[PDB]
Write a protein that binds this DNA or RNA. Structure first.
Ligand SMILES: Nc1ncnc2c1ncn2[C@@H]1O[C@H](COP(=O)(O)OP(=O)(O)NP(=O)(O)O)[C@@H](O)[C@H]1O
Ligand SMILES: [Zn+2]
Length: 250
RNA sequence: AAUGGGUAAUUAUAGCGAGCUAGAAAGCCAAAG
């Protein structure tokens, strides 16, 4: 999805910066919104990274059914507007107080129990109804999104035929430089079930109406009382100057 | 003494054996959007 960019693409690297940043907010938000379908918060998440995020949850039935139902919810969201290019696969290993110095073959042997369930669910993706609804036919499409070859919701953003996600990514590339990224319900790129992402300035938080706010690269607590993400980014200049600034002063 | 004749050595020696500048640019594309 990220290196779907090719030769003769409208976006140079803003369509690549804003695309590898967007999936990282999606990986952040799956981790966040999974923890309030449960009763938990950010402490229980051991790590979040490039789509991978390890947790510590409770070995009980009301959590496992919440895991399965939220997994089906987010995969319905990914099928609604990414069409089997993105698939999130949960997986959970039950363990006692065995991550404590049967000392060698107890810790990693249950950390790998979740990776086996992921590899089993990554390999047998869907079920009956959600694949019969896939290849149901019924579409007289003439055109397609020339970035990702999708069909639904075609617009003419800068006289090229692009889709709903790949116009939201240009809008997010105009909004990428901000520190604050809020989740609304109907604005910008969708990142979940009834949950969309929008980049916002600081003093526009009273104008906008959100539910959860992320602040990027900040250790001060701030005013919005946000969730602190940390994405590495830097821009000294635009890309086309990087050859011309390759000279010395002489 | 005349008379017959020439015979030996060197066949090039000492050097420099290339130096410096340029080492791909400008367009299409990409950017500008
Ligand atoms: N948002 C992102 N932007 C840029 N690079 C990323 C991002 N997320 C992950 N990556 C990179 O992608 C790597 C993982 O690639 P990938 O093969 O997709 O792993 P995966 O999540 O297991 N997908 P798959 O290989 O199909 O199972 C990471 O190690 C990162 O280097
Ligand atoms: Zn697209």
């Amino acid at each position: 999805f990220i290196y779907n960019i090719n030769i003769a693409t409208n976006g140079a690297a803003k369509q690549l910066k804003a695309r590898s940043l967007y999936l990282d907010f999606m990986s952040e938000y799956i981790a966040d919104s999974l923890l309030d379908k449960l009763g938990l918060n950010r402490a229980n998440m051991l790590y979040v990274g490039g789509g991978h995020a390890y947790f510590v949850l409770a070995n009980t039935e009301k959590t496992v059914e919440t895991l399965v139902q939220f997994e089906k919810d987010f995969n319905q969201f990914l099928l609604a507007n990414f069409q089997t290019r993105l698939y999130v696969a949960f997986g959970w290993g039950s363990f006692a107080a065995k991550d404590i110095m049967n000392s060698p073959e107890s810790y990693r042997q249950v950390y790998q129990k979740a990776s086996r369930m992921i590899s089993k669910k990554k390999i047998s993706r869907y079920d009956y109804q959600t694949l019969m609804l896939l290849n149901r036919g019924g579409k007289s499409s003439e055109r397609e999104c020339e970035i990702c070859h999708s069909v639904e919701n075609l617009v003419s953003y800068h006289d090229q035929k692009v889709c709903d996600i790949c116009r939201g990514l240009y809008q997010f590339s105009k909004e990428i430089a901000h520190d604050h990224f809020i989740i609304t319900e109907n604005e910008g790129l969708p990142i979940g079930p009834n949950a969309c992402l929008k980049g916002v300035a600081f003093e526009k938080l009273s104008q906008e109406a959100f539910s959860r706010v992320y602040v990027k690269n900040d250790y001060k607590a701030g005013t919005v009382k946000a969730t602190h993400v940390f994405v590495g980014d830097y821009q000294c200049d635009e890309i086309y100057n990087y050859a011309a600034l390759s000279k010395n002063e002489n």
